[PDB]
Amino acid sequence: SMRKKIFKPEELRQALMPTLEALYRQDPESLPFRQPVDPQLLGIPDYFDIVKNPMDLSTIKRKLDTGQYQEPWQYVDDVWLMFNNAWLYNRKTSRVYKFCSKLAEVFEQEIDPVMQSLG
């Protein structure tokens, strides 16, 4: 469409926060994603050489709380950025990679009816 529907901040928050909470509820799968990757603490100094645009659950939560999303696709894009970052950097045998794959399955399931409700 050429006429982008306007979403109120609280409309986006009420619709989308339950899908973020569904990711947070995955335990242990969400544990590596609840805070930004700290490459120095984690002993992986090559991280920012590979991941140019970091993203995590706490950043997305803050963006939802502060009205930084004007439409739901922006929120979906940030969640997918988090996923694609983990699938890019981590080896396929690693816990973070397999945990990412589980979160993406959960997010796909939860986000579909919500995007239909938002129109």
Residues forming contacts to ligand 99E in the complex (CB under 6 A) are 28, 31-33, 37, 42, 44, 47, 86, 89-90, 95-96
Least separation in angstroms between residue 89's CB and ligand 99E is 5
Least separation in angstroms between residue 75's CB and ligand 99E is 18
Counting other chains too, the contacts that 27-34 makes at CB distance below 8 Å and 24 or more residues apart are 28/99, 29/99, 29/102, 29/103, 30/57, 30/99, 30/103, 31/99, 32/86, 32/95, 32/96, 32/99, 33/57, 33/82, 33/86, 33/99, 33/100, 33/103, 34/58
Output 47 or 68, the one with its CB closest to ligand 99E.
47
Least separation in angstroms between residue 63's CB and ligand 99E is 17
